[PDB]
Design a binder for this molecule. Sequence first.
Ligand SMILES: *Cc1c(COP(=O)(O)O)cnc(C)c1O
Ligand SMILES: *Cc1c(COP(=O)(O)O)cnc(C)c1O
Ligand SMILES: *Cc1c(COP(=O)(O)O)cnc(C)c1O
Lengths: 711, 711, 239
Amino acid sequence: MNVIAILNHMGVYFKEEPIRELHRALERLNFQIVYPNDRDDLLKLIENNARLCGVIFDWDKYNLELCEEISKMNENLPLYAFANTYSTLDVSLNDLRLQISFFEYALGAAEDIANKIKQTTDEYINTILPPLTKALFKYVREGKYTFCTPGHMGGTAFQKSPVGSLFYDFFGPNTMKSDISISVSELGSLLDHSGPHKEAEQYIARVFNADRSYMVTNGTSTANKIVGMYSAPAGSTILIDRNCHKSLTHLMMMSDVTPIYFRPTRNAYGILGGIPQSEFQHATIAKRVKETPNATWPVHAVITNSTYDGLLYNTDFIKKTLDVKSIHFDSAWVPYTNFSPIYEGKCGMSGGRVEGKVIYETQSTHKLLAAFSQASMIHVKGDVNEETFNEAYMMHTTTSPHYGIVASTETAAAMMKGNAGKRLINGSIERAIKFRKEIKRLRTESDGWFFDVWQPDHIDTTECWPLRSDSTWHGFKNIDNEHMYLDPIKVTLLTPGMEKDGTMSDFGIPASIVAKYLDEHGIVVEKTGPYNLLFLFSIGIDKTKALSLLRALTDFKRAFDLNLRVKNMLPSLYREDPEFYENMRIQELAQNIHKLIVHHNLPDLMYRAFEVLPTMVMTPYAAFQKELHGMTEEVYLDEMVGRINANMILPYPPGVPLVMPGEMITEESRPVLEFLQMLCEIGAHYPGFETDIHGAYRQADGRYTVKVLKE
Amino acid sequence: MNVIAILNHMGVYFKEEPIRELHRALERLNFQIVYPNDRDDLLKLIENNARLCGVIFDWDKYNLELCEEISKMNENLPLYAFANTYSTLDVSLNDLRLQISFFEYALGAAEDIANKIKQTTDEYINTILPPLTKALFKYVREGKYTFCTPGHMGGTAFQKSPVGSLFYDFFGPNTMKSDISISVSELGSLLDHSGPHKEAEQYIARVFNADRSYMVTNGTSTANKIVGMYSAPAGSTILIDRNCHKSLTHLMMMSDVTPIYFRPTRNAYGILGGIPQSEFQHATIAKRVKETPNATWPVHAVITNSTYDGLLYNTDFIKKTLDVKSIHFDSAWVPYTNFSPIYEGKCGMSGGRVEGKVIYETQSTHKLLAAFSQASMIHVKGDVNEETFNEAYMMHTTTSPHYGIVASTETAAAMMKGNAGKRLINGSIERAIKFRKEIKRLRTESDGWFFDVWQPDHIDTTECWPLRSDSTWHGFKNIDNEHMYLDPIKVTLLTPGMEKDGTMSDFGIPASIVAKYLDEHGIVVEKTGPYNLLFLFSIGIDKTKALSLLRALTDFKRAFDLNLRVKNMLPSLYREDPEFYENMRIQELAQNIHKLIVHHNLPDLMYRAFEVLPTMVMTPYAAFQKELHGMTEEVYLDEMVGRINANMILPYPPGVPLVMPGEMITEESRPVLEFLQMLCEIGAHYPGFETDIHGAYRQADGRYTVKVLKE
Amino acid sequence: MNVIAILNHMGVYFKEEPIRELHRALERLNFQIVYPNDRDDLLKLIENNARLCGVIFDWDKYNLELCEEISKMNENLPLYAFANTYSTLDVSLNDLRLQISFFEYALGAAEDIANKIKQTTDEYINTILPPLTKALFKYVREGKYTFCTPGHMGGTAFQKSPVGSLFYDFFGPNTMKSDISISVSELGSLLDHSGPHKEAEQYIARVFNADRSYMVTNGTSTANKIVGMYSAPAGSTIL
Ligand SMILES: *Cc1c(COP(=O)(O)O)cnc(C)c1O
Ligand SMILES: *Cc1c(COP(=O)(O)O)cnc(C)c1O
Ligand SMILES: *Cc1c(COP(=O)(O)O)cnc(C)c1O
């Protein structure tokens, strides 16, 4: 932050001479001097260059063309405008947040002007930063408190060991000095909720529109277990979603509760939809209570909004139909549904406090924002006990938190405040919609097959495309209108190979081959398998990272139409088995895999398997108790009908659980077992595409083994 | 790491000319050149300067005086010794780990020598570093895999926001690039325990002498709950220590178990001793099972070794008398009991595998070592199930671990391996023993009172001082011999004010006033209150931080003997209440507080209160169930006899729990209630020394309120 | 105030090399470096030279010949003494007012040492000066309050008149900026006897051994008329 802009050359000498004298004075305090050209030149030095804090221009030249466009980007940006004798303001310059510092054209006084710019720049730094981060940066340059934790104390022990000097010189001197615990008086403690930590929690909830919010320092996987243990006593009933996370499954194994799984919607490509509106009724929930042994009235509900693919729900209908006093929303993929008018009424924070209910959200911080890993939040909207919810937060958070992540956790809430942060959320949406139009433009004009974006036929708008009932792009039968939304920054590329009715075709390329082709250039697909390609277009994807993805997609069509070899296209796959992948081309491998999907019938053995649910004998908490006593055994995959599993089956593809720990496969869940045996055959012929199931151990013959319980 | 040493000036020209030519060649690749004088000069450039990797000296001048002292410090340190024509080795140079690189004195070949030094230096970096850290540093300069988590992607989003540029320019560009998740193929995942993470768990367990060790990324407070949820089913019996931690209390409130509290020893100064040998008997444990309703055979035991003050126990006697198959040792203060011969047989890892038992330890990493915060380990010594214990670890660690802390967790185990790490553990002990002798030297020679170290009269040794039965320095009656140890790096300053029998005196200064006086110069007291001052002498405490503590202690005697004012000595205390602390001196405040301790009788109302235990009605897990249902109420402190509390009482001073959540104060625990009412009176007369109890809330009249359960 | 003294030479290289690295780091923040000779050389750099604030010497060489003579001349004078491994204090160093800052001989950390000396020097300035004078110097560097008396406002009107530029350039920029009236909130007023002016009256009386003392701004000739008009009514008798 040391860029000073000097716009507009008057041509006279009594105005350019003070500029030349100031040029030699600002460089003595480390400041970069730039000279833009016209009005459009200064506008490009703010959106692209974020390290600018000084704009020098003539006030009697552009008093209305610069005070309006700059105010729409940054409000507290200092403006070192130079006025004259006959200078005045304008009536249209009253409702604009600006910081204009006037000066004169006096010779010899250039030294006093340089001291005022440095003092004004320090005021801008001490304003846009939160008080928690301000106390961290001040303690590095001035704090000298000895005998504190940790033992390194800014890297003192690293300067005495030969191996410790390499780890300290990589990050930097200012990196280890900010690693302090609760051994500081002028910073308070995180568990005490006092001092700078008290004002930090009120600053995040005010920007994100909330009443009280904490700072989880162990990722979202930990924040879901703290809230789940607040409104679920031993022996109650919870309403967890079927499309849950690995951490959400362990929550059912740590508390003696009786969960009730929902019935989400799904298509044939593998993209899971959402929970229908009929499941939130009173006659639907109460019907499953009597059918499930040992189950009372549900007091907590876990809703995955959005899912792993990115599909927003309708919170305006759940907060009125679902009769749960503690409704939870797993907002681990949408930490931005507030800073844009196309996201109002789509989350729990949008709106107001529900009478007699409370909304919990675990907005991830390190997922789709800009902060260190292992960072999460707990958004509470309602009237809860402060002395009770505080004890549950200390059950998973240590007494010495890492302030390096805490400073970045609150930073994400400050980077989005104001018009400077709205240009990053709306900017990523405009870059995502532009990428969606570049696919349809290069599809009809191309000569052959081309990738397709899972989007409606009409994308001539900047909002969330609703999933209506008279469309064929989504392919969700019996879908509810005004309930399923689409995330514009969640572009899902649909590779050719299937039709629009859900059947198979004759010519197509699976998404597993494209996933490895993008890895050679440094692109890893977020979700691949059947015929989908999920990508993340958050604030970290600029115009360079977005255009680099389109160029790699055009190279795959050129290499496939010319029929190239595997060695001259996929060097990483050739090193796995050079003998088998010798005389093989890109067209021979793409056609042999497509025939195996039609032969084994993948879309049918996957849709019917995920629809039915195995018979849940006991609660997931009771299954973990038998494992600690040693009553577990390893059986074959073909010999397991009528047994209780011990772990959760997570087959890849897709990425959703199959059998929960504590269920039994009877005659109702017959297609469930057929889905596991089909992946063991298709993933054994060609190397590289082996079967990936988190729970199936590979032996020395080919047959996988599962972990069940003793009879 | 770029320091090259050139020792011994022969005086000739055919040997000094290649040195001058090499001086201009090594500077082109960023290397600092130093020229030591005699033999003692080179020895000071290694212990103090850890960034050295090149030693150039004549082989035919000091072939035995340098190859022996350097080998005792660093083994893999390269030695760029220059040999001659008539050069040979020595018989005494066979059992020494060195790396000697021979060269010649050729003109013009100085460029080829610089390439060999840079290549040898790169081999030294790629050897002393663990494979997990090596893969993290290499991924920064080569790995460019985009479209992955976290969202910042090396700090890309920070370059677009004005406030984000100030946070990216603080830690450094190489800091954000090293923040990656499990979205990397060549680094594996932490939950999968494969790849670099698989070899990292074996490298730590080998140095720390263990079979399997993990890396907890949420501090030690979280790792204690992982072991507690493995050998303690719902309805069993655990043996938790009375001197537990805040996280250990929440473990009893999350699992339906029946804990049995021990009876640790204690004196009058507030320093808690340890568990006697009689509590580990079979007739003592089985007697408390019948007296406690709903209690079976104990299957798990939690032993706090060491405590908060630093007192090692006797693991050689516990592992034979205590009949518990799952014995836990809370080693949250001794992460170094395997690098010195004066610590053998004092921890659970020392020795061998116990037949039919298993030892669990939670060594703290960010306490007395050198690593980032929120880092812990789980040491397992026994025969446990791998597929069962792994599920308990994933119930508290997120799926995307922060590799910045994981790389530093294994670094702490790598910085101590070899003789280079033994000089830091034994070096901190030598600096601690030297500090203990400087107190007794400045006590008799001084003219007046002086601080005293809680140590025996004979400290003329370098080992752990045992607590015998014929000594008066410890003041623990009915103590067991060869069971209580002393940590030399845990110096506890005993301020004058009490006698050696446990009564009170006439002249003394409390430790609370000294605690605030040390904060002015930059010294934070770890534990204070009655008449004790606990400090931490880790590896980070060098000779500068050690000598700075003695100077501040001598300044307190000078300011007190001359009778100075509070405003001219304690500026922080004067700003709290300038009106009351106006006409007050340092002698008037030190004498008024000492009379309040004798009047209210603190040592008697604290020793008898901690001895007796309240009547535990229900288990701590059952007390948390009534809090979620809204059956709590706030009552006065004077009206609570016969009620069940909801929170844990943690009064300061000292720092140990008083009443556990789920206990009742009857007629047996009468002194327990008197201890809470005594602190409310002594901490209300003079500002700054208010009553600090983690459980009692301050109202608007003076009387504190507690949180109990409804009848 | 920017003179740093480095006394004695141990002759070794692991102690003189950190001195050479610190020599190039202290000059970047405007600090003069002097190299005294023997013990009598450092004593002449304190009584004669008053702009000195840093004394660097070996702790294991003159631990009693320097900590006694310097204490007899200045109490809050910082002492940047470098200690070693086998270093300790003396029993005759308990009743002496000194400010000893310990360091090491580590290479590469010369930049961090320069930041500790600059902050220690700033703490020395903010301690020996009274709070009234300290608040006046900070108001000049940090103070953009407009529409206040007097009319010059740090010398603003002097930059417009040709004759006024000769009077403003004679004293200095920091001279006219320190001439402020009671138009400042964080400095209080002299007639109100509150804020910094309240603590200044109690500080002067404590130095000159008194209970209360004011500050007359019109010489002694005016102070004699204030006391005379307090204990001499109309028609009384004075001696
Ligand atoms: C990725 C994810 C998590 C894990 O996020 P972390 O911050 O790494 O713990 C938890 N829940 C959901 C729904 C996720 O998608
Ligand atoms: C300090 C301490 C802890 C907490 O350590 P962290 O690594 O910060 O989690 C836990 N137990 C004991 C006994 C402690 O002293
Ligand atoms: C010199 C003198 C004065 C005048 O002093 P000023 O401070 O200039 O007013 C007054 N009284 C006596 C006795 C003097 O000697």
